[PDB]
């Protein structure tokens, strides 16, 4: 059954609630982004309206084969009326096409649902600045102080310099980047840009990337592996066995692999700076785990909430254990007392 933290009180609306069959009383289903934990249940046989971003709507049509008549894309940063209710879609700073949703309830309550997001001070000058928010449905993925990680710009610097150095040393080295969903495309696009190459990939993944409205994308990606020295593979092939195998497939064009796994957080972050990251190495293969996050750090999170000053917070992640729920509630109380709302 649909859990409470996916329902919007006083509306006919749910968020990210496609795996529970027909939800009783739901007149419109919102989808925040195209990640399988959130779209779980959609398919070509879905017949209610779906509200979402343009990019999300491209993916639902082309990857899931949802019929066009049920896809309702909305522009970002624009006041729209859905089923008698005013709504705005905001950029989540998550993966391509990801949005937060502002809902203006007919009784005058205002609700923000962040979807998945990486809080940023730029959000403090969106349409959020212009009114009070009563309730916040918050992405609490990393809502603990041990979750620190660097900015995305720092991590991209590290990857660029790393890849440029190795390939300049050895023009016969191949770079591989692991992927399993949309998101984090900056990692492989940055690296291919510094090396003067296109990114090569499967037909399925090229198709997914053709849905995203990225500028000049025909110029950066390809399905011809032979012409590219940056390859993408499934995240599950990013290991010594998978990478030896792939290397054999390139027909002696290459004699070394430098591979990247963009992870969220890894406990190495409590001790080690980005400058100090080192690979796992076996033979002619090295593997780097890089902490490229598309979710808020604890501090980034805390700053957004203290700025927004909500009356009530409803977590949408780590809600399944009493120890989690307790821990989060304690931080929310700390933030409130420190700021004074
Ligand atoms: Ni996500």
Swiss-Prot record:
Cellular component aspect of the GO annotation: fibrillar center; nucleoplasm
Phenotype when changing residue 295 to A: Impaired nuclear focus formation, reduced interaction with PIAS and increased sensitivity to cisplatin
Principal location class: nucleus
Keyword annotations from UniProtKB, A to Z: Cell cycle, Cell division, DNA damage, DNA repair, Hydrolase, Isopeptide bond, Metal-binding, Mitosis, Nucleus, Phosphoprotein, Ubl conjugation, Zinc, Zinc-finger
Tissues showing expression: Expressed in brain, heart, kidney, liver, pancreas, placenta and skeletal muscle.
Localization annotation: Nucleus
Residues passing through the membrane, by range: none
Organism domain of life: Eukaryota
GO molecular function terms noted in the UniProt entry: 5'-3' DNA exonuclease activity; beta-lactamase activity; damaged DNA binding; zinc ion binding
Outcome of swapping residue 139 to N: Impaired nuclear focus formation, reduced interaction with PIAS and increased sensitivity to cisplatin
Expression induction or repression: During mitosis. The mRNA encoding this protein contains an internal ribosome entry site (IRES) in its 5'-UTR. This 5'-UTR generally suppresses translation while specifically promoting expression during mitosis, when cap-dependent translation may be impaired.
A biological process from GO: interstrand cross-link repair
UniProt family annotation: Belongs to the DNA repair metallo-beta-lactamase (DRMBL) family.
Function: May be required for DNA interstrand cross-link repair. Also required for checkpoint mediated cell cycle arrest in early prophase in response to mitotic spindle poisons. Possesses beta-lactamase activity, catalyzing the hydrolysis of penicillin G and nitrocefin. Exhibits no activity towards other beta-lactam antibiotic classes including cephalosporins (cefotaxime) and carbapenems (imipenem).
Record text on subunit structure and interactions: Binds constitutively to TP53BP1. Binds CDC27, which is itself a component of the anaphase promoting complex (APC). Binds PIAS1.
Protein name according to UniProt: DNA cross-link repair 1A protein
């Amino acid at each position: 059954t649909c859990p409470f933290y996916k329902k919007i009180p006083g509306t006919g609306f749910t968020v990210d609630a496609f795996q529970y069959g027909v939800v009783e009383g739901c007149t419109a289903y919102f989808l925040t982004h195209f990640h399988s934990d959130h779209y779980a249940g959609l398919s070509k046989h879905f017949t209610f309206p779906v509200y979402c971003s343009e990019i999300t709507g491209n993916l639902l049509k082309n990857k899931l084969h949802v019929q066009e008549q049920y896809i309702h894309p909305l522009p970002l940063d624009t006041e729209c009326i859905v089923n008698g209710v005013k709504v705005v879609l905001l950029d989540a700073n998550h993966c391509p096409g990801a949005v937060m949703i502002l809902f203006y309830l007919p009784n005058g309550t205002v609700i923000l649902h962040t979807g998945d997001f990486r809080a940023d001070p730029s959000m403090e000058r969106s349409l959020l600045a212009d009114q009070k928010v009563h309730m916040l449905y918050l992405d609490t993925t990393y809502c603990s102080p041990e979750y620190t990680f660097p900015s995305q710009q720092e991590v991209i610097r590290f990857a660029i310099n790393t890849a440029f150095e190795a390939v300049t040393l050895n023009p016969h080295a191949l770079v591989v980047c692991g992927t399993y969903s949309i998101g984090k495309e900056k990692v492989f696009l940055a690296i291919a840009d510094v090396l003067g190459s296109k990114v090569g990939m499967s037909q399925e993944k090229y198709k997914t990337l053709q849905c995203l409205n990225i500028p000049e994308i025909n110029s950066l990606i390809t399905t011809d592996m032979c012409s590219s020295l940056v390859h993408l593979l499934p995240m599950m092939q990013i290991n010594f066995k998978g990478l030896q195998s792939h290397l054999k497939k390139c027909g002696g064009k290459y004699n070394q692999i430098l591979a990247f796994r963009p992870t969220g957080w890894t406990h190495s972050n409590k001790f080690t700076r980005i400058a100090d990251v080192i690979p796992q190495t076996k033979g002619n293969i090295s593997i780097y785990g890089i902490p490229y996050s598309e979710h808020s750090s604890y501090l980034e999170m805390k700053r957004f909430v203290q700025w927004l000053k909500p009356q009530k917070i409803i977590p949408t992640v780590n809600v399944g254990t009493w120890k989690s729920r307790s821990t989060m509630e304690k931080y929310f109380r700390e933030w409130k007392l420190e700021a004074g709302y």
